[PDB]
Amino acid sequence: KNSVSVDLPGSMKVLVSKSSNADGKYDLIATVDALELSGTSDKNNGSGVLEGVKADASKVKLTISDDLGQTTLEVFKSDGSTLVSKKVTSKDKSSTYELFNEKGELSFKYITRADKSSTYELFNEKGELSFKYITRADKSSTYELFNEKGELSFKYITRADKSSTYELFNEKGELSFKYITRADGTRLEYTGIKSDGSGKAKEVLKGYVLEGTLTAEKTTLVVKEGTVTLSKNISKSGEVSVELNDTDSSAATKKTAAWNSGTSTLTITVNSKKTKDLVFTSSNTITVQQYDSNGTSLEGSAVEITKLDEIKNALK
Amino acid sequence: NSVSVDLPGSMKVLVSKSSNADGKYDLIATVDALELSGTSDKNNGSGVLEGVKADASKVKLTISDDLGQTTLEVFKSDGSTLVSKKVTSKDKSSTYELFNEKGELSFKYITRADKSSTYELFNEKGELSFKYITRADKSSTYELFNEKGELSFKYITRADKSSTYELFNEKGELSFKYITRADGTRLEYTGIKSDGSGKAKEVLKGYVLEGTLTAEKTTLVVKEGTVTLSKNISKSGEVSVELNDTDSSAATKKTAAWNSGTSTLTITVNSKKTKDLVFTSSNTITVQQYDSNGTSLEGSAVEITKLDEIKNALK
Numbered sequence: 112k113n114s115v116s117v118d119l120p121g122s123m124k125v126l127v128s129k130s131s132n133a134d135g136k137y138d139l140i141a142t143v144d145a146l147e148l149s150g151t152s153d154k155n156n157g158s159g160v161l162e163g164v165k166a167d168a169s170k171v172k173l174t175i176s177d178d179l180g181q182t183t184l185e186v187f188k189s190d191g192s193t194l195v196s197k198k199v200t201s202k203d204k205s206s207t208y209e210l211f212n213e214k215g216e217l218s219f220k221y222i223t224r225a226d227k228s229s230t231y232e233l234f235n236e237k238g239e240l241s242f243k244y245i246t247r248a249d250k251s252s253t254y255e256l257f258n259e260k261g262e263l264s265f266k267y268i269t270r271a272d273k274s275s276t277y278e279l280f281n282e283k284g285e286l287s288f289k290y291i292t293r294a295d296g297t298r299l300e301y302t303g304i305k306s307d308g309s310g311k312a313k314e315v316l317k318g319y320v321l322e323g324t325l326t327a328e329k330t331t332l333v334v335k336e337g338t339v340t341l342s343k344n345i346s347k348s349g350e351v352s353v354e355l356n357d358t359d360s361s362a363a364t365k366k367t368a369a370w371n372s373g374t375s376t377l378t379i380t381v382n383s384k385k386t387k388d389l390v391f392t393s394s395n396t397i398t399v400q401q402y403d404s405n406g407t408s409l410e411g412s413a414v415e416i417t418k419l420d421e422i423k424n425a426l427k
Numbered sequence: 428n429s430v431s432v433d434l435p436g437s438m439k440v441l442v443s444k445s446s447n448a449d450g451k452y453d454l455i456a457t458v459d460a461l462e463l464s465g466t467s468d469k470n471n472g473s474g475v476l477e478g479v480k481a482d483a484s485k486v487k488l489t490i491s492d493d494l495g496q497t498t499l500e501v502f503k504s505d506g507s508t509l510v511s512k513k514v515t516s517k518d519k520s521s522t523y524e525l526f527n528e529k530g531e532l533s534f535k536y537i538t539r540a541d542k543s544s545t546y547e548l549f550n551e552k553g554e555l556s557f558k559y560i561t562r563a564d565k566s567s568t569y570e571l572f573n574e575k576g577e578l579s580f581k582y583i584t585r586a587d588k589s590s591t592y593e594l595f596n597e598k599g600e601l602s603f604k605y606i607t608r609a610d611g612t613r614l615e616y617t618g619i620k621s622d623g624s625g626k627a628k629e630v631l632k633g634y635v636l637e638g639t640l641t642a643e644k645t646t647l648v649v650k651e652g653t654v655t656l657s658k659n660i661s662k663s664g665e666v667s668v669e670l671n672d673t674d675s676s677a678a679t680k681k682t683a684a685w686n687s688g689t690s691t692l693t694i695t696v697n698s699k700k701t702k703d704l705v706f707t708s709s710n711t712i713t714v715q716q717y718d719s720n721g722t723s724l725e726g727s728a729v730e731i732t733k734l735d736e737i738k739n740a741l742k
C-alpha cells in the first residue's frame with residue numbers, strides 16, 4: 112500500500128511490507144503471469160521466497176537470492192516437487208530456461224550468455240541431450256547432433272558469409288569425414304579420415320577438381336603430367352603454397368619452379384629460362400601467363416584455367 | 428576413331444566406331460583425371476566404366492540406357508565396399524551417399540529440382556536417426572527419430588519466422604507443442620494426453636491467458652467476480668469468444684453475443700449494450716463503450732494490454 116517496490120533481475124518487481132506479519136516477518140508480494148505470489152522474509156531488501164498455487168494446484172515458486180544477484184522461477188506439478196519449468200536470471204542479463212517432461216526430466220534448455228551467444232538444447236523422449244543449436248555474436252550458427260554416449264555425431268556450422276563446415280564423427284568419437292563449402296562455392300571434401308588425422312582430399316573448383324591427401328599438418332593436392340608433379344598445399348588456416356618436382360634428369364627438359372607467397376605465383380623454369388607464371392588467385396582460380404623467349408617479360412595476358420587438362424598442358 | 432557424348436553431372440564419354448573382340452563397343456571417360464573404361468552393346472554412351480586409383484580404390488561410372496541418369500561410385504580396393512555414391516539426373520537433381528568404414532550408409536543428401544533439399548543421418552544399426560528438410564516455400568524441418576522409427580521431436584521454422592516445436596513421449600504420442608507466431612505471440616500446450624487434451628497457455632503482448640486443450644478446441648479463460656470470459660481457438664486458429672455470469676439478477680447479470688464476421692463480443696447488462704470487445708487479427712483486444720442507453724458506440728476503441736484491463740471490462 113505504502114509497501115516498498117524493489118526492482119529485481121529479469122525485469123521483475125517485488126513489494127515489501129513496512130509492517131510485520133503474524134509470524135514476525137516482512138510480507139513479500141509479486142505477480143508473475145497473473146498469479147499473485149506471496150512469501151515472508153526476515154529481510155526487507157526484496158530477497159526471499161514467494162509461492163503461489165494455480166487453479167490446477169500447480170505450485171509456482173520465485174526465489175530471490177539474498178543479495179538480489181539472481182532470481183529463480185520454478186513451476187512444479189501439484190506435488191510441489193516435479194518440475195515443469197525453471198527460469199534462472201542474473202542482473203547481467205544472462206538467463207537459463209528449462210522445460211521438463213512428464214517425468215520431471217529435461218525436454219528443453221535455453222541459455223543466453225554474457226558473450227551474447229544463445230544456446231538451445233533439445234532432448235529426446237528419454238531426457239537425453241540430442242541436439243544443440245547455438246547462435247553467436249559473429250553471426251555463426253552451429254548445429255550439433257549427440258548420440259547416446261553424449262558425444263558428437265555431427266557438427267554443422269554456417270557463417271554470415273554463407274560458407275559452412277560439416278564434421279562427421281564415427282562411433283569412437285573421431286572425425287571421419289569433413290566437407291567445407293567456401294563463401295565462393297568452391298569446396299574441400301575429406302573422406303576416410305583416420306585416427307591419426309590422415310585421409311583423402313579433394314578441392315572442388317569451378318571446372319575441375321584437384322585430388323590428394325590430408326595429414327595433420329596440411330592438405331596437399333597433386334596434378335601429374337609426364338614426370339612432373341605439381342603440389343598445392345593448404346594449411347589449416349587456408350594459406351595456399353605451391354611446389355613442383357620433375358623426376359626428369361635431362362637438363363634441357365627438366366621443369367623446376369619457384370613460389371612467391373607474397374604474389375601467390377609459381378614461376379616455372381626450363382633450361383635456365385622462365386617459361387610461365389601460374390597465379391593462384393583469391394577467387395580460388397588459377398591463371399597462366401607465358402614469358403617471352405628471353406625469359407624476362409611476361410607476354411600477352413594471363414589466362415584463367417578452366418579444366419584439369421589445361422593445368423596438365425602447363426606442366427608439359 | 429570414337430564419338431563424344433555429353434552426360435548428366437557435366438561428364439562426357441567417348442564411344443568407339445568399331446567393335447572389340449567381344450563384339451561390343453568401347454567406352455572411355457575421364458572423371459577427375461582418372462581414365463575410366465568399359466564396354467557396351469549400345470553405342471549411345473550408356474553403360475558401365477571403371478578405373479583404378481594408385482591405391483587400388485575403384486571408381487565406377489554407370490550411365491543409364493536412356494542417358495538420363497549417371498551413378499558415380501567410389502569403392503575400397505575390394506571393389507565392393509562403398510565409400511561414396513553420387514546419382515545425378517538429367518534434372519540436375521542428385522543424391523549423395525556417404526558410407527562408413529564398414530560400407531554401411533551413414534548419411535544421404537538429396538537436392539531436388541523442387542529446389543529443396545533433404546539430409547538424412549543413419550545410426551550404427553542402419554536406422555534413420557535425424558532428418559533436415561528445406562523447401563521452396565523456405566520452411567525448414569528438423570526431425571529426430573527413436574528406436575521404433577517414430578518421431579522424438581520435430582521443429583519447424585517458416586519463411587515468416589513462425590515456428591512449431593513438437594515433442595513426443597515414449598509411446599510416440601504428442602506430449603508438448605509450442606507455437607510461436609510471426610508477431611511473437613505464442614501458444615504452449617503441455618501435458619498432452621492420448622486423446623489430444625492437455626493444458627494451454629497463450630502468451631500475448633502484455634499478458635498471458637491460460638486454459639485447456641481438447642481435440643475440439645483450445646479454451647482460455649479470464650475470471651472476474653461471477654463472470655467467466657472464454658476465448659476459444661479452433662485447430663484452424665479461428666478465435667470465438669463466449670461469456671457466462673453466475674449472477675442471477677436481471678439488473679446486474681452480464682450476457683454476451685459473438686459476431687464472428689467482426690470478431691466482436693458485445694456485452695449486455697439489464698437489456699442494454701455496455702461494451703464491444705474486439706479480438707483483432709494482431710492478437711490484441713480492444714474495448715469500446717456504448718452510450719448511456721446502450722444505443723450506439725461512444726468514443727474510440729482502446730487497445731487493452733494488461734490482464735487487469737480485461738478484468739475491468741468484465742466488472
